[PDB]
């Protein structure tokens, strides 16, 4: 057992670096490693490995006091040396965590004494806090098992202060978790967790069936949505499905004809019927998106006119621009030129392609031609990274990522949303807006900045928004209720109770 249980994961957890990317699998990282201060759902940190913390009144100098009972689960001492040693180890690696404002920001990391860690920046960076909250990379591992005493060429055993041991791991198969039973802080009820590996979503449903694994636990790619449904209605098994964590939605290449010219971004914007491709290729699972960010998240409650399914006047824009249909044709020309957009996705994923074939007939019904780019996960990723797309599926990150992060992360031209906004005139103040944003500690401005990047995002049609997803549960009774993590990316076994 009653207190062992068996999910499943696409592919196996990785070798569990705390400082990498792929193949880490962020949730198992977050299952092992631990942060100096620990998100929370209103928004907030706690103390976690670090039971307090000081800053001077610029803002750019951090001290914080460390817990002195905490040990790696080899046995060795989590101290201020141990956390020091981690931050060089990260920042050794700089270039890599671009992404993450925090790691261009900390200027120097020092321990002070063995519970004194001193944190210095380059300015007064106000997500600091936030960002040393997530999974990775600013988590512990223990230093003895650096390799050559840095972490980015690889380490050796994945040792962290976490509730959770991994035990084993079989390539292609699965990976065993086990609980510390020398954690620092309270005892998981589940003694040992298996993850079988099952890359078809199809097959995640038929193991849960049979019973062969006892809880499915992710996004709306988790299993197939129609069968999520019939699940709910069955009195054997469990189901849940949470309030929204983040937004899907098209990024449309400003810099990129056609998509370079504003009328047809939001003449797209008026094209799909939303609700009815969530009814029809989501099983009506998920809400309507209006905006980039659901009004919801905090800094984008900002009133924001949404634009309707209204094809008549997508048309007519369309027209007004000089979009015409030539005699006898059903897609638009202009100056010779065919209304053509390429939709890039992964072409194995099946709820992107049946999601993107909606979107193409939604489209010729105003006049587009939409033309369907189906490739392998490498081939979309590098598309993403240099704009060699016209329209791609894209979403943001949930809590605590949005909107600053993911905000933040627009200004680095290896990101799919640097590249989207790429033709934009007003591009180099969005991305100096960003960064003062990032920076601001009055209130009101930051405020203001949060409210003009936004709507110019919005007003540009840069994003053609398509729901606010939820993270879905399928789970055996016999388990229970199933808690969410704050972090959208976490799954909180520890606060599971059979
Ligand atoms: C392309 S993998 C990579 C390479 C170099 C540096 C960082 C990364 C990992 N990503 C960094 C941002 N990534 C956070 C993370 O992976 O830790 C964003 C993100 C946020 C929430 C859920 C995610 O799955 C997710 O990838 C790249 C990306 O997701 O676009
Ligand atoms: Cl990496
Ligand atoms: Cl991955
Ligand atoms: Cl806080
Ligand atoms: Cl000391
Ligand atoms: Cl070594
Ligand atoms: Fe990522």
């Given at each position: 057992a009653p207190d062992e249980i068996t999910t499943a994961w696409p592919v196996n957890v990785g070798p569990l670096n705390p400082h990498l990317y792929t193949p880490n699998q962020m949730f198992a990282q977050s299952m092992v490693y631990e942060p100096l201060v620990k998100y929370q759902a209103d928004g907030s940190v706690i103390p976690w490995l670090a039971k307090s913390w000081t800053h001077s009144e610029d803002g750019k100098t951090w001290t914080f006091t460390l817990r002195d009972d905490v040990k790696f689960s080899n046995g060795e001492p989590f101290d201020a040396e141990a956390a020091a040693e981690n931050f060089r180890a990260v920042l050794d690696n700089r270039q890599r965590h671009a992404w993450l404002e925090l790691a261009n920001q900390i200027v120097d990391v020092k321990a002070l004494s063995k519970t004194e860690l001193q944190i210095t920046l380059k300015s007064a960076y106000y997500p600091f806090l936030q960002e040393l909250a997530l999974p990775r990379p600013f988590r512990f591992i223990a230093?003895?098992?650096?390799?050559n005493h840095e972490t980015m060429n690889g380490i050796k055993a994945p040792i962290g202060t976490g509730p959770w041991i991994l035990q084993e791991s079989k390539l292609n198969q699965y990976d065993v978790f086990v609980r510390n039973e020398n954690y620092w802080g309270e005892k998981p009820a589940i003694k040992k967790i298996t993850f079988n590996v099952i890359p078809d979503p199809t097959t995640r449903a038929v193991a849960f069936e049979t019973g062969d694994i006892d809880l499915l636990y992710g996004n709306e790619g988790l299993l197939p949505l129609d069968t999520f449904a019939r699940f709910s209605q069955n009195p054997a098994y469990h189901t849940q499905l949470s309030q929204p964590i983040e937004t899907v939605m098209l990024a449309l290449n400003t810099a990129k004809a056609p998509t370079n010219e504003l009328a047809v971004r939001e003449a797209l914007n008026y094209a799909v019927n939303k609700k009815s491709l969530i009814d029809n290729?989501?099983?009506?699972?998920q809400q309507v998106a209006d905006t980039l960010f659901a009004p919801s998240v905090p800094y984008a409650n900002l009133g924001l006119k949404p634009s309707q399914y209204d094809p008549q006047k997508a048309k007519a824009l369309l027209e007004k621009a000089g979009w015409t249909l030539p005699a006898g044709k059903d897609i638009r020309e202009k100056n010779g030129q065919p209304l053509r957009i390429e939709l890039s996705f992964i072409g194995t994923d099946a709820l992107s392609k049946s999601m993107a074939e909606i979107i193409q007939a939604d489209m010729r019904q105003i006049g587009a031609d939409v033309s369907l780019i189906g490739e392998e996960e490498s081939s979309i990723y590098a598309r993403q990274r240099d704009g060699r797309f016209g329209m791609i599926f894209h979403r943001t990150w949930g809590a605590p990522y949005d909107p600053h992060a993911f905000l933040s992360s627009m200004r680095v031209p290896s990101h799919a949303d640097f590249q989207a906004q790429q033709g934009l005139a007003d591009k180099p103040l969005i991305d100096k807006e960003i960064g003062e944003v990032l920076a601001t500690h009055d209130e009101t401005q930051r405020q203001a900045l949060y409210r003009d990047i936004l709507t110019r995002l919005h007003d540009e049609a840069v994003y053609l928004p398509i729901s606010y997803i939820s993270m879905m549960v399928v789970s055996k009774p016999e388990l229970g209720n199933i808690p969410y993590a704050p972090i959208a990316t976490e799954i909180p076994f520890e606060q599971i109770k059979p």
């Open positions: 230093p003895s098992q650096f390799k290729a989501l099983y009506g699972t």
